[PDB]
Structure formats: structure tokens, C-alpha cells
């Protein structure tokens, strides 16, 4: 089984060198969306079942664990991802280069449970452990 | 075609008599938000094109005309709606019962455009014609 | 002329979502009786004349047509209202959301004391979708 | 080595969708009883030795760990199985779909005539999600 850790470290270094943070983040978000397109959870009824299915999907590729919590007062879905794979000393903070991938992946995964056309965004919440990623899912925009 | 003018006048009278002003305003804002999800403009590029599309949508139902203007120094989007439909003497001022609906409607119409993010607020202003409604859109 | 069809559809959706059916029906009966205080028929001593006047009022507001029948087994009035305005799929059955409005309207119209049917009470009861059948019994 | 986790997730989904819960539970209990005829523990006269042998079998199949305790109030047997394999979000509670398999497996394993607990009956009843509590009663 080939190892891509060194290759991904070098690729992250090169991309950050020749490409800014925002462009790299957009590319990684699109990559996460494509990854979610490739692997899908089944249509779940509750948050607990969706969390179990997403954790099974993550264990299929060994990308960590996920916890989902619906915040009614915040009107959001807090997504806590633990043990994000590390591809070197890249990202903000260092070691979290694959966080936009998680943003896109979880956006696709949870939107798959929604209606036909929903406008939702997953945003990274910038003593949390280094590889733990906290994200919030909510509507893209709204007015009151 | 059935005429709902008298029914709407009576409905406004009974709602104002039964519930408060704020409850009615919130209900009408929600009604406008739901209306914005049934008829929608295409994704526009500039303010003028969005104004044209919103005017076409309003003419589809005959609810009046709109003018949009970006205030950079005040950091908002002034929305002036002319010829709002009138249903009786209810509302503040009298005859502007459906004014909160616009607050929802435009609120759904502009936040649905590409580039909108987060929470926004559409607030109506409190020389101007009676049926003319002036609203300002800001970030919440 | 402003079109209130889409607005009424969305309003019925929101009201049904927020308050339910019984509260909505009571509110619409209130609205119907309020509408009755705004348009009234002249005092009629005959069911046929009352039917003509009510149809004239309905044509004035465009809310369909009506037929009145005075049953003989019991002193009750059968009211068949055809072409009730439809605003969305709300109501039971779907499409009949302004039926309590008809209940209140016919309770106010028929029960004028200057006529002959001043002691009746409405009770809503193959049939077309937008056809509403109600009974008024003393 | 083939991975049957996704296949078992889909199979549990389909079986629960088609036949329901009680029929699925009975089928999985039968499957557990059949598994009890493939791998068997030696005849054990004590709870501790039987627990060691059952843990050895579970480590052989990698299905978790087990603790057995003898309750003297009724001479019953309490079975605590930790780290049951998870085959998706199916089951009651979610993630526990192979629990009837454990019921049948422990019913076949514990009740051996040459042993000392050959007259017991299975019964599944803050614990972790994959921890399964069973009771053996005469």
C-alpha cells in the first residue's frame, strides 16, 4: 500500500507557496464536495443515526470521528470533527491543512439529507486539540 | 376573478382587533418571506438588472413598482416601493397594512442573490405618498 | 388591480402552520361575520327573493353562486354554494380554505331579524371540490 | 481480506425495511444459534472458566469482550458484552443490530449439558452504546 503522507506534505507546501490561502481553501472545499459526491450516507431519520452513518463513512477512510449537535438558539448544526489527518506543518493552525476538505465534505453529506434545493453553508469556527475541527452549518443568508 | 379586497379589509380589521400590532407585523413578515420563496428573481449582476427583475415580478402580481439604491456612506440598500396595494384603513399609516409583507418579500429577494452572507435586516422608514413604502436593508 | 391570490395562499399556509384548524376556522368565521356587516341583503320574506339578493351580493364580490332550499321535514335551510374561491391547497378538503368565511357570511346574511329567517344557525356539512354545503337550523 | 461492513450496513437496512423488527430479531437469534454450533467452548464447571473460554472465542472472532456474573438472589447469570460490532445505524438502540445474534450465541454457548449452566434461558435487558446486557434465568 503506497504512502502519500510525504507527497501530501510536499504538495501542501508547494500549493501554499505558489497559491494564496483563499484559493487553496476554495480548491480544498471543492475537493471535499467531490469526495462527498463519491461516498454518501443513507437517508437518515435522526441526528444520532446520521452521526453513526457519517462516523462509519469516516472510518471507511480513517479520517477521524464526528459529533453533531443541533443548536436551536444559535439556529445551526455544530459539527465537531476529531482526529483530522495531518499532512505536515501547513494550514491555520499548522497541521489543519485539510479543514476546507471537511467543510465541503460535511456540507455535501448533510445537504444530502435536506430538501431538493437548500442553500446551506458549513463554516469553520476560527483549548481545542490541534486536529479537532469545529464547524457550524446554517443557511447561507437570511433576513428578518 | 374573485375579489379579495373586502375579505382582506375584514381580515385586517379582525386581526388588528384580536392580536397586537407586533404579532400582525411578524405574521405579515413571515407571509412575505413565504411569498418570496414562491416567486423568485434570476441571479442578477447589478442593481439595475435586479430592479428590472423585481419590477417584473411585482407586475406579475400587480403589487406596485420598486426602486433600489445603494447607500455606501450609510452602508445600506434603500428600497422605495410605490403603489403598495391598499386593503382598508388598517396599518400605520392607515392603508399600509401590507407594508410588513414587503419587509419579508424584499428580505427574501435580496438575500437570495449571490454574494449575500449572514443575517440581514429590512426595516421600513417611520412628502412621501401614503402607499409609498421606504425600506432600508442592513446587516443585522 | 392588485392580485391577492399568491398572498392569500402564503397567508393560509402560514396561519395553518402556526395556529392549526379549529382556531383558524374560528378566525375565518369571525372574518365572515365581519364581512356580513359590510355587505347586507335587503330584508326578504321569501327564500327565492333571499337567494336572488344573496346571488347579487356574491356577484358584487365575485364569490361564486348560491342556492337555498327550505326543507319541509324540518324547518331548516340547505345552502349549496358553488364556485367558492380557491387559494392554494389549504383547507379540508384541499382547496376549500374560505369555507368558515362562508359560514359566518351566511349566518350574518340569512339571520336578519327584519326578514323571516332571523333565528337560524349555520352548521357546515360526488360534490364538486369548490362546492360548499351548509345547513341552517332554527 | 474482504470488508463486509458496508455490505452488512446495506443488508441491515434492507432487512429492517422489508420484514420489520421482530422477524429480523428472530432471524438474527437463529443466526446466533447457528454460530454457536460452529465455534463452541469446552465444558466449564465455573463461571470464571466459562468467561475465560467465551472471551477466547470472542477474541478468535473479534466480536468484543464478555463478563459473566452469578446472581445468588435467583442463581441467575448476568452477561455484559462490551464492544459489540457495529454494522450501521440500524437496531434498537441505533448501532446495535447484532444483539439478537449475541442472544442466540450466548444461549448456545452457556447452556451445555456437560457444563453447569445447561438449563438457562436468554433475555436481553449509562452503559455504552455497544455494550449489551443479557440475563440467563432458569
Amino acid at each position: 500500500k503506497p504512502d502519500f503522507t510525504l507527497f501530501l506534505q510536499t504538495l501542501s507546501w508547494e500549493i501554499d507557496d505558489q497559491v494564496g490561502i483563499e484559493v487553496r481553501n476554495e480548491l480544498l472545499r471543492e475537493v471535499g464536495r467531490g469526495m462527498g459526491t463519491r461516498i454518501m450516507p443513507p437517508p437518515c431519520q435522526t441526528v444520532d443515526k446520521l452521526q453513526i452513518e457519517l462516523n462509519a463513512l469516516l472510518a471507511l477512510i480513517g479520517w477521524g470521528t464526528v459529533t453533531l449537535e443541533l443548536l436551536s438558539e444559535d439556529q445551526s448544526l455544530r459539527i465537531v470533527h476529531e482526529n483530522l489527518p495531518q499532512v505536515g506543518s501547513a494550514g491555520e493552525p499548522s497541521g489543519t491543512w485539510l479543514a476546507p476538505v471537511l467543510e465541503g465534505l460535511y456540507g455535501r453529506w448533510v445537504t444530502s439529507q435536506a430538501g431538493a434545493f437548500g442553500d446551506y453553508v458549513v463554516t469553520r469556527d476560527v483549548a481545542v486539540p490541534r486536529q479537532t475541527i469545529i464547524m457550524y452549518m446554517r443557511v447561507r443568508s437570511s433576513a428578518t | 376573478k374573485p375579489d379579495f379586497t373586502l375579505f382582506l379589509q375584514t381580515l385586517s380589521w379582525e386581526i388588528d382587533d384580536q392580536v397586537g400590532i407586533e404579532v400582525r407585523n411578524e405574521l405579515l413578515r413571515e407571509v412575505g418571506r413565504g411569498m418570496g420563496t414562491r416567486i423568485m428573481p434570476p441571479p442578477c449582476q447589478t442593481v439595475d438588472k435586479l430592479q428590472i427583475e423585481l419590477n417584473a415580478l411585482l407586475a406579475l402580481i400587480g403589487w406596485g413598482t420598486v426602486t433600489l439604491e445603494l447607500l455606501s456612506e450609510d452602508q445600506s440598500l434603500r428600497i422605495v416601493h410605490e403603489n403598495l396595494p391598499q386593503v382598508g384603513s388598517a396599518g400605520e399609516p392607515s392603508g399600509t397594512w401590507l407594508a410588513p409583507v414587503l419587509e419579508g418579500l424584499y428580505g427574501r429577494w435580496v438575500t437570495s442573490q449571490a454574494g449575500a452572507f449572514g443575517d440581514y435586516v429590512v426595516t421600513r422608514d417611520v412628502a412621501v405618498p401614503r402607499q409609498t413604502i421606504i425600506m432600508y436593508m442592513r446587516v443585522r | 388591480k392588485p392580485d391577492f391570490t399568491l398572498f392569500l395562499q402564503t397567508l393560509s399556509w402560514e396561519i395553518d402552520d402556526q395556529v392549526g384548524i379549529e382556531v383558524r376556522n374560528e378566525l375565518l368565521r369571525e372574518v365572515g361575520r365581519g364581512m356580513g356587516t359590510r355587505i347586507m341583503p335587503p330584508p326578504c320574506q321569501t327564500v327565492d327573493k333571499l337567494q336572488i339578493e344573496l346571488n347579487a351580493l356574491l356577484a358584487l364580490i365575485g364569490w361564486g353562486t348560491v342556492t337555498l332550499e327550505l326543507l319541509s321535514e324540518d324547518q331548516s335551510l340547505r345552502i349549496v354554494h358553488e364556485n367558492l374561491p380557491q387559494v392554494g391547497s389549504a383547507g379540508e378538503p384541499s382547496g376549500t380554505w374560505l369555507a368558515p368565511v362562508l359560514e359566518g357570511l351566511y349566518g350574518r346574511w340569512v339571520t336578519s331579524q327584519a326578514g323571516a329567517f332571523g333565528d337560524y344557525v349555520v352548521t357546515r356539512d360526488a360534490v364538486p371540490r369548490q362546492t360548499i354545503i351548509m345547513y341552517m337550523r332554527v | 481480506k474482504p470488508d463486509f461492513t458496508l455490505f452488512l450496513q446495506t443488508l441491515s437496512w434492507e432487512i429492517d425495511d422489508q420484514v420489520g423488527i421482530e422477524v429480523r430479531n428472530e432471524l438474527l437469534r437463529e443466526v446466533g444459534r447457528g454460530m454457536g454450533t460452529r465455534i463452541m467452548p469446552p465444558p466449564c464447571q465455573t463461571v470464571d472458566k466459562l468467561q475465560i473460554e467465551l472471551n477466547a472465542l470472542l477474541a478468535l472472532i473479534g466480536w468484543g469482550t464478555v463478563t459473566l456474573e452469578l446472581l445468588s438472589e435467583d442463581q441467575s447469570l448476568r452477561i455484559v458484552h462490551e464492544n459489540l460490532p457495529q454494522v450501521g445505524s440500524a437496531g434498537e438502540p441505533s448501532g446495535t443490530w447484532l444483539a439478537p445474534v449475541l442472544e442466540g450465541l450466548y444461549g448456545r454457548w452457556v447452556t451445555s449439558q456437560a457444563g453447569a449452566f445447561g438449563d438457562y434461558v436468554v433475555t436481553r435487558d449509562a452503559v455504552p452504546r455497544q455494550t449489551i446486557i443479557m440475563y440467563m434465568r432458569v
Binding site: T46, K49, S76, V139 | V19 | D17 | -
Partner: peptide, 28 residues
């Protein structure tokens, strides 16, 4: 349910559906 919100409930809360008209009408 299973002690957890449903997906439909989650998306209703995200949309914003989570005095009031019902309470005002009951009071009156």
C-alpha cells in the same frame, strides 16, 4: 424519536421555524 432531533426538525430549525399568534388567539 430516539432522544435525538429528526433531520426534518434540524432543517426546520436551520430555516428558522424552531407573544405568538397561537397564544394571542387563545388569550383573546
Amino acid at each position: 424519536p430516539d432522544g435525538s432531533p429528526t433531520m426534518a426538525e434540524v432543517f426546520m430549525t436551520l430555516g428558522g421555524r424552531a407573544p405568538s399568534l397561537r397564544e394571542a388567539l387563545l388569550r383573546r
